[PDB]
Amino acid sequence: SGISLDNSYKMDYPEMGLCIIINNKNFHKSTGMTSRSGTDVDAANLRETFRNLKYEVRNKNDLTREEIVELMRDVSKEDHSKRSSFVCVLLSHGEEGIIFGTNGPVDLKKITNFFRGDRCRSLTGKPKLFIIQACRGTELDCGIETD
Amino acid sequence: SGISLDNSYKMDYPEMGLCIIINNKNFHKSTGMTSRSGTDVDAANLRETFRNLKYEVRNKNDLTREEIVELMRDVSKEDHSKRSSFVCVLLSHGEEGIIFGTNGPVDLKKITNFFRGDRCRSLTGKPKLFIIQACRGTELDCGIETD
Amino acid sequence: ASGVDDDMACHKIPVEADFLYAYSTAPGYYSWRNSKDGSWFIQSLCAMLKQYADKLEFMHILTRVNRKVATEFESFSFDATFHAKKQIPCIVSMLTKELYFYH
Amino acid sequence: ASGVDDDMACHKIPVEADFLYAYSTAPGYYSWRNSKDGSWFIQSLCAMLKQYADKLEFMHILTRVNRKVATEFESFSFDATFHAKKQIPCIVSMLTKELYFYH
Structure with missing residues (x-):
């Protein structure tokens, strides 16, 4: 055939893939974390x-x-052979490198490691997207008036 | 005039801007850091x-x-009004969030803060690029055979 | 030219390759959420995906999200400490190819 | 629709907006450099800039850099601990617009 470049991920597999949404709104009283209204x-x-x-x-x-x-472990153990990509959206309280479960923290690294190229072979070479809505610290951006 | 979208940075100012290259090859013996051959x-x-x-x-x-x-402070204090952007390349030893001077560490945040939208007004709204060649930790990627 | 670290007989890729982290905010910063309308980031991400997923490459879509959140949102709080604050999402790409949701 | 955190009378942008950090390696990882040819990342970045700066948007150029470093390089060391290792650069964008070096 003609010239092949291969500059974009193959997204024409039978399935686009999974989009796992973890929506944490209510947290155990023991954690002292507030509910996330609007999530x-x-x-x-x-x-x-x-x-x-x-x-x-x-x-x-x-x-x-x-x-x-x-959940992450189980999902990473599925056969993603016929899926073009993987998407995971995390909605919760957080800190730098951390996402909170309803009863405590989870290192983002622990979650993403399940999908490493050598640990989830059916996703090797495929885009793995993690969308994270959570704090990454306590700094506030005062902004600057534009002109 | 016709429809204006504004989806790309204005890069047609009189000057493209500065490209500051900090090349640290030799480090003070007291730091115990090795020379960076090839830099x-x-x-x-x-x-x-x-x-x-x-x-x-x-x-x-x-x-x-x-x-x-x-150097960073002085550069951020220049008048970048006629420059489209700013580029800084850091070549040295490092750790997560740190770049090493020949006699000790420098927080990357300290360097980049000089260029904040509210601290370097002649660069507000313009792309500020920091290219960093340095370690961000001690982890090694074993890789995975592709198929 | 020849060397010790290139043109390997057995092709491998980094185990950390092909990951994309779309963070709602910059490293070290709080992330804002409207108790009624949802988070600034997710609101904006969905809006840009709905409008551009069949037209733009993913990084360009996320760049539009960055601009939307950065320009259109500012916090409101009775507490002066948390009032009139801004936010900029943070795209972290370890992808090796362009990504289009369509084909 | 109307709310407390949008459509501000006085337009402001985040002080952290419009920054782009092109890291040679992923968070927490060592970065590799050839004592004779230079670092894998800078070698690749210059090569992609020379070839695509007058053709592609910056994020797409950096994505090519990611692929080049990820596929073409692998360490060589007499020390088994540091031998046969890989690297993936890390693009961190807080930019709000597309960036082309040409106009």
Whole structure:
């Protein structure tokens, strides 16, 4: 055939892939974390948006740190051979490098490691997207008037 | 006039801007840091590459942590009104969030803060690019055989 | 030219390759959420995806998200400490190819 | 629609906006340099800039750099601990517009 460049990911597999949405709104009283009002609006908007992009959207609400790890592990162990990509959206409280389960923190690295090129072979060479809505610290941006 | 979109930075100012290259090859014995053989090749390649992109390239070799901060402060205090952008290339030893001067570390945040939208007004709204060749930790990527 | 670190017989890629992290905010900063409309970042991301997913490469879509959040949002708080603040999302790409949701 | 955090009378942008950090390696990882040819990242960045600066948007150029470093380089060391290792650069964008070096 003609010249082949290969500058863009192959996105024409039978399935676009999974879009896992972890929506943590309510946290255990013991953690002292406040409820995240408005997160359901985000979760619904994401579901509809990725639905239209042809992703297999799966939503989970208020997961403990254990459930988050279990979910990610299970998902990474599925056969993604016929899927073009993988998407995971995390909606919760957080700090730099951390996302909170309803009962405690989860290192983002622990979550993403399950999808490493050598640990999830059916996703090797395919784009793995992690969308994170959570704090990364306590700094505030005062902004600057534009001109 | 016709429809204006404004999706790309205005890069047609009189000058493309500065390209500051900090090339740290030799470190003070007291720091116990090894010399970075081959960095001069990088510095020269960068100078030529950005020269062809019409940047005003300025090179500095073996700067102490104090000199790095002083250089950045002075540069951020120049009038960049007629410049489209700003580029800074850091070549040295490093750790996460740190770049090493010949006599000690410098927080990358300290360097970049000088160029904040509210602290360098002649660069507000203009792209500020920081190219960093340095370690960000001690992890090694074992890689995975592709198929 | 020849060397010890290139043109390997057995092709491998980094285990950290092909990951994209779309952070709602810059490193070390709080992330803002409207208790009624949702987070600034997710609101904007969905809006840009709906409008540009069949037209632009993903990084360019995320760049539009960066601009939308940066220009259109500013916090409101009765607490002066948290009032009139801004936010800039943070795109972290370890991708090796362009990504289009369409083909 | 109307709200407390949008459509501000006085337009402001985040002080952290319009920054782009092109890291040679992923967070937490060592960065590789050839004692004779220079660093894998800078070698590749200059090569892609020379070839694509008058053709591609900056993020796309950096994506090519990511692929070049990821596929073409692998370390060689007499020390098994540091032998046969890989690297993936890390693009961190807080830019709000597309960037072309030409006009």
